[PDB]
Amino acid sequence: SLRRGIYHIENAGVPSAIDLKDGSSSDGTPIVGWQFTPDTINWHQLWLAEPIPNVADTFTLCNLFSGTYMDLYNGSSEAGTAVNGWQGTAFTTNPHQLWTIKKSSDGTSYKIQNYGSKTFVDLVNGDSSDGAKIAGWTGTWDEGNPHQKWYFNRMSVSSAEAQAAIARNPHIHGTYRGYILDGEYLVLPNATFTQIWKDSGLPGSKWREQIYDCDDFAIAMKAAVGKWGADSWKANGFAIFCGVMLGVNKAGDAAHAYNFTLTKDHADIVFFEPQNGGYLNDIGYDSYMAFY
Amino acid sequence: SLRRGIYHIENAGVPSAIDLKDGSSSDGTPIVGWQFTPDTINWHQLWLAEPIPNVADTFTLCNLFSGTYMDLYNGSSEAGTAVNGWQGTAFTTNPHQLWTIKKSSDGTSYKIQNYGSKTFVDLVNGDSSDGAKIAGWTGTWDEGNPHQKWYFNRMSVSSAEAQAAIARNPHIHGTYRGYILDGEYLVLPNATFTQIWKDSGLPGSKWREQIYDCDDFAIAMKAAVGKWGADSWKANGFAIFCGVMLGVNKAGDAAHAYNFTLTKDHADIVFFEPQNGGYLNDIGYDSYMAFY
Ligand SMILES: C[C@@H]1O[C@@H](O[C@@H]2[C@@H](O[C@H]3O[C@H](CO)[C@H](O)[C@H](O)[C@H]3O)[C@@H](O)[C@@H](CO)O[C@@H]2O)[C@@H](O)[C@H](O)[C@@H]1O
Ligand SMILES: C[C@@H]1O[C@@H](O[C@@H]2[C@@H](O[C@H]3O[C@H](CO)[C@H](O)[C@H](O)[C@H]3O)[C@@H](O)[C@@H](CO)O[C@@H]2O)[C@@H](O)[C@H](O)[C@@H]1O
Ligand SMILES: C[C@@H]1O[C@@H](O[C@@H]2[C@@H](O[C@H]3O[C@H](CO)[C@H](O)[C@H](O)[C@H]3O)[C@@H](O)[C@@H](CO)O[C@@H]2O)[C@@H](O)[C@H](O)[C@@H]1O
Ligand SMILES: C[C@@H]1O[C@@H](O[C@@H]2[C@@H](O[C@H]3O[C@H](CO)[C@H](O)[C@H](O)[C@H]3O)[C@@H](O)[C@@H](CO)O[C@@H]2O)[C@@H](O)[C@H](O)[C@@H]1O
Ligand SMILES: C[C@@H]1O[C@@H](O[C@@H]2[C@@H](O[C@H]3O[C@H](CO)[C@H](O)[C@H](O)[C@H]3O)[C@@H](O)[C@@H](CO)O[C@H]2O)[C@@H](O)[C@H](O)[C@@H]1O
Ligand SMILES: C[C@@H]1O[C@@H](O[C@@H]2[C@@H](O[C@H]3O[C@H](CO)[C@H](O)[C@H](O)[C@H]3O)[C@@H](O)[C@@H](CO)O[C@H]2O)[C@@H](O)[C@H](O)[C@@H]1O
Ligand SMILES: [Ca+2]
Ligand SMILES: [Ca+2]
Ligand SMILES: [Ca+2]
Ligand SMILES: [Ca+2]
Ligand SMILES: [Cl-]
Ligand SMILES: [Cl-]
Ligand code: NA
Ligand code: NA
């Protein structure tokens, strides 16, 4: 079963993503196929899948930027029916906004079925051009048709996944304790993480004994990423990944405070030095505490 | 012996504080007696006492706002010699900026003796008016003269003192761990702590599930107080007191993130709710983690 999380949803036949046109929160905004850039934030193309209680393999899909929901227009089972963004809520009973999402016969991509109509999300004619219609269409679960097949490229981690990545790192102190603050996190490309750092003012901050020293830099970076998250996205129910760590050197006589992020494959952490914007696989300290 | 820390230094005969006139960093800026407001930040009247290694009861005194040092003009032992702010460093060997500070014969106030001249800091004629001269003057350690006696009202806590205040609180979870980040902290009046909160933008922030929830508010408040500290004071070697706590309710099924500060007497903590600006002796949670 697809796990709760944020996804970039890519057609299996052509490299078009499911895109809420212009990110608009207006009701009836078309959802279309559009090209994308890997290892970026694709601002109009991220979707938060919320599982519905007690209803197997069925979800709402909330666009991260707009806060509005994937909606089959008037629930029609007619082939060609518009799929649009529309106001709703995460656990709605409106079948127009409920989607059963299960693996296709290729075992890798998924099909996306409206719970009311039993029709499928379809990139009409497999058209790869920017702005191509997506519609609800007749189909079957088992058929090959790539117009109706979608890769769910996972862009978030659960808190358990983040904890795993930390735990496999080789620079963790024997006394380490982690303090988990949220449940599901958008993982930033480093290019975005860096942009947040630049825009925070931290690049120009001077180190000062106690009054603006390593701990201040690290906390400020975290606060900046938290502020970015709220100011950037209208959906709720997720956080942005950015940790703080305290660590001690091998000799045991010096401590440091710094940040960390996750690799692209989500399997490992990478340390960030907020005093200079550097990413490091080894910062010279073993973490004894983290919060994220 | 006087402990390292930040002090408001008040004459024992009249309620005038040692004030660096207009907070000016210019060399030769007069240090004068001036009236003060209790339970405020007295912006030009705070002094960081740094003990000198191996030199008993002797200190530099750094004005917190200007970053410049109490300086006996040309080290003269003549009565009437100007005491002024002047550029220097925390561990200087310049005797003009070194001060032996020991209790007076009243056992409560201190006398302040220049290490080079052996003369004493003197509120000339005990004049209580705003801008009254302070000078180096002949004197003795044991005499009663209130012109040369000074109360060192302690405005900072060491990290050990903060840890003690936390440890005597009744709302600490059995699993509590604290993570200390600095050594010496200016304690804010609540009126200042609140002003920082107001100026941070947090009063207008909306709670949002995971993306701007309790943990974000608490971290943001801490970051705001850290930024205020650096932007407000030119001296180094101290931090501003502002903690973050994570806590769990009595039933064990809900957690919260919030801030804390210290009472005026420095002996107890007080919880601050960054979602509404409230101070509470009981926030409804027992702290399982704190960083400060
Ligand atoms: C059958 C119809 O269902 C609901 O209306 C839906 C729309 O539902 C969504 O938007 C409306 C506002 O237009 C409202 O906010 C609702 O809570 C939300 O779920 C929407 O799905 C459109 C497009 O497919 O179709 C229907 O208009 C309900 O509001 C109506 O009263 C009625 O029961
Ligand atoms: C090229 C074409 O691919 C398949 O047709 C698709 C459509 O397939 C879906 O609709 C048809 C009915 O129109 C039938 O229900 C099929 O099982 C279902 O997957 C649909 O994807 C549309 C819009 O994108 O495009 C193509 O017409 C195939 O069935 C056709 O025979 C033909 O090979
Ligand atoms: C004997 C004299 O001592 C030092 O000069 C002091 C001044 O010292 C302070 O300021 C100067 C700049 O004016 C410099 O930054 C120095 O490091 C700092 O300690 C000051 O104490 C004034 C007023 O009392 O008196 C003397 O000018 C030293 O710089 C001189 O070379 C000389 O050794
Ligand atoms: C009212 C006055 O108080 C004392 O005189 C002080 C001064 O005291 C200091 O200087 C005198 C020499 O001028 C002597 O060295 C004394 O031990 C020392 O404390 C001084 O504080 C000045 C400037 O503020 O004011 C007064 O003159 C006392 O000695 C006088 O007899 C007289 O009672
Ligand atoms: C926020 C906005 O994002 C980009 O434009 C989006 C656009 O983004 C996708 O397509 C462009 C090419 O048009 C690139 O492949 C991006 O990597 C994709 O994410 C689409 O989402 C459309 C339709 O909704 O809206 C545009 O606003 C970017 O080109 C803009 O500069 C801007 O940053
Ligand atoms: C930063 C500045 O602080 C206050 O003026 C200071 C002044 O502050 C002291 O005296 C005033 C009365 O003049 C009150 O008692 C304050 O509680 C004291 O802290 C002195 O430090 C003088 C001389 O150095 O400089 C003034 O700038 C305040 O009145 C100003 O509004 C302002 O906030
Ligand atoms: Ca949370
Ligand atoms: Ca600090
Ligand atoms: Ca520190
Ligand atoms: Ca959060
Ligand atoms: Cl088939
Ligand atoms: Cl006497
Ligand atoms: Na830097
Ligand atoms: Na509020």
Side-chain angles (χ1 to χ4, degrees):
Chain A
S1 288
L2 185 75
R3 291 176 293 129
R4 182 172 191 282
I6 304 171
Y7 299 91
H8 188 254
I9 308 169
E10 176 183 349
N11 181 259
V14 302
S16 289
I18 297 196
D19 181 299
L20 179 62
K21 204 179 180 170
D22 208 36
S24 186
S25 61
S26 303
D27 290 340
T29 296
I31 289 172
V32 298
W34 209 280
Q35 70 180 297
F36 62 93
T37 311
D39 305 311
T40 70
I41 295 302
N42 289 283
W43 279 97
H44 310 155
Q45 301 179 353
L46 294 174
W47 299 83
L48 177 63
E50 184 77 67
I52 299 308
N54 320 135
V55 179
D57 294 298
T58 303
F59 302 79
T60 50
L61 292 172
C62 185
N63 189 272
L64 212 71
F65 181 77
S66 70
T68 61
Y69 291 77
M70 182 182 291
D71 183 289
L72 180 65
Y73 187 62
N74 285 319
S76 183
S77 67
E78 188 174 6
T81 294
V83 173
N84 303 307
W86 207 285
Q87 65 179 293
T89 59
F91 299 106
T92 191
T93 58
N94 180 354
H96 306 173
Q97 294 179 3
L98 294 172
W99 303 98
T100 301
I101 308 176
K102 302 183 70 178
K103 286 294 181 93
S104 79
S105 59
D106 71 38
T108 309
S109 65
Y110 290 81
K111 306 196 54 151
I112 307 167
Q113 183 183 54
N114 183 265
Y115 182 79
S117 71
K118 306 308 191 191
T119 57
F120 292 94
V121 177
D122 181 310
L123 183 64
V124 183
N125 280 323
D127 180 353
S128 62
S129 70
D130 293 334
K133 186 177 286 173
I134 292 172
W137 206 285
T138 52
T140 72
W141 283 100
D142 55 290
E143 65 186 339
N145 181 358
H147 305 174
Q148 294 180 12
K149 293 195 311 185
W150 299 97
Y151 301 116
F152 274 65
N153 292 321
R154 191 166 159 74
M155 310 316 306
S156 61
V157 293
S158 65
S159 57
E161 290 170 327
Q163 178 175 47
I166 294 164
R168 76 181 55 98
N169 193 267
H171 308 295
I172 304 304
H173 197 259
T175 61
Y176 173 87
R177 304 280 317 269
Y179 298 92
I180 294 175
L181 302 172
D182 291 309
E184 191 69 28
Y185 302 90
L186 182 66
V187 177
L188 297 181
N190 286 1
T192 299
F193 202 91
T194 285
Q195 184 65 49
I196 302 166
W197 179 72
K198 285 193 181 163
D199 291 341
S200 75
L202 285 166
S205 298
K206 175 173 184 52
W207 181 99
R208 301 169 59 191
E209 182 191 329
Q210 298 195 47
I211 194 66
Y212 214 78
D213 66 333
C214 53
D215 44 276
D216 302 279
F217 284 80
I219 289 172
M221 177 61 181
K222 186 149 178 53
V225 171
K227 182 180 180 72
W228 178 85
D231 287 359
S232 298
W233 308 111
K234 306 171 196 68
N236 297 322
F238 68 105
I240 310 307
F241 196 80
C242 183
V244 170
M245 272 178 169
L246 313 179
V248 61
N249 66 348
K250 265 295 188 296
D253 56 14
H256 189 50
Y258 46 98
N259 295 108
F260 70 102
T261 187
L262 296 156
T263 59
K264 174 196 312 203
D265 74 358
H266 300 177
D268 281 286
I269 61 167
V270 175
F271 304 111
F272 180 75
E273 176 48 77
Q275 288 178 59
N276 67 30
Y279 301 86
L280 293 175
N281 293 323
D282 188 2
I283 194 153
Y285 298 85
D286 295 325
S287 175
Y288 65 87
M289 191 268 258
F291 55 95
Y292 56 95
Chain B
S1 288
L2 185 75
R3 291 176 293 129
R4 182 172 191 282
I6 304 171
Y7 299 91
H8 188 254
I9 308 169
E10 176 183 349
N11 181 259
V14 302
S16 289
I18 297 196
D19 181 299
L20 179 62
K21 204 179 180 170
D22 208 36
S24 186
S25 61
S26 303
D27 290 340
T29 296
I31 289 172
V32 298
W34 209 280
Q35 70 180 297
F36 62 93
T37 311
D39 305 311
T40 70
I41 295 302
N42 289 283
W43 279 97
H44 310 155
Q45 301 179 353
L46 294 174
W47 299 83
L48 177 63
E50 184 77 67
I52 299 308
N54 320 135
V55 179
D57 294 298
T58 303
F59 302 79
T60 50
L61 292 172
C62 185
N63 189 272
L64 212 71
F65 181 77
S66 70
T68 61
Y69 291 77
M70 182 182 291
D71 183 289
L72 180 65
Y73 187 62
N74 285 319
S76 183
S77 67
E78 188 174 6
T81 294
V83 173
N84 303 307
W86 207 285
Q87 65 179 293
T89 59
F91 299 106
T92 191
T93 58
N94 180 354
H96 306 173
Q97 294 179 3
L98 294 172
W99 303 98
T100 301
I101 308 176
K102 302 183 70 178
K103 286 294 181 93
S104 79
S105 59
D106 71 38
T108 309
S109 65
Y110 290 81
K111 306 196 54 151
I112 307 167
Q113 183 183 54
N114 183 265
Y115 182 79
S117 71
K118 306 308 191 191
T119 57
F120 292 94
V121 177
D122 181 310
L123 183 64
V124 183
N125 280 323
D127 180 353
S128 62
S129 70
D130 293 334
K133 186 177 286 173
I134 292 172
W137 206 285
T138 52
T140 72
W141 283 100
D142 55 290
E143 65 186 339
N145 181 358
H147 305 174
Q148 294 180 12
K149 293 195 311 185
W150 299 97
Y151 301 116
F152 274 65
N153 292 321
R154 191 166 159 74
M155 310 316 306
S156 61
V157 293
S158 65
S159 57
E161 290 170 327
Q163 178 175 47
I166 294 164
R168 76 181 55 98
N169 193 267
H171 308 295
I172 304 304
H173 197 259
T175 61
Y176 173 87
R177 304 280 317 269
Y179 298 92
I180 294 175
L181 302 172
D182 291 309
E184 191 69 28
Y185 302 90
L186 182 66
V187 177
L188 297 181
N190 286 1
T192 299
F193 202 91
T194 285
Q195 184 65 49
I196 302 166
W197 179 72
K198 285 193 181 163
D199 291 341
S200 75
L202 285 166
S205 298
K206 175 173 184 52
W207 181 99
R208 301 169 59 191
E209 182 191 329
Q210 298 195 47
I211 194 66
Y212 214 78
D213 66 333
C214 53
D215 44 276
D216 302 279
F217 284 80
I219 289 172
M221 177 61 181
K222 186 149 178 53
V225 171
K227 182 180 180 72
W228 178 85
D231 287 359
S232 298
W233 308 111
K234 306 171 196 68
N236 297 322
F238 68 105
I240 310 307
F241 196 80
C242 183
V244 170
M245 272 178 169
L246 313 179
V248 61
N249 66 348
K250 265 295 188 296
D253 56 14
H256 189 50
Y258 46 98
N259 295 108
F260 70 102
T261 187
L262 296 156
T263 59
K264 174 196 312 203
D265 74 358
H266 300 177
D268 281 286
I269 61 167
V270 175
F271 304 111
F272 180 76
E273 176 48 77
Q275 288 178 59
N276 67 30
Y279 301 86
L280 293 175
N281 293 323
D282 188 2
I283 194 153
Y285 298 85
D286 295 325
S287 175
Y288 65 87
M289 191 268 258
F291 55 95
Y292 56 95

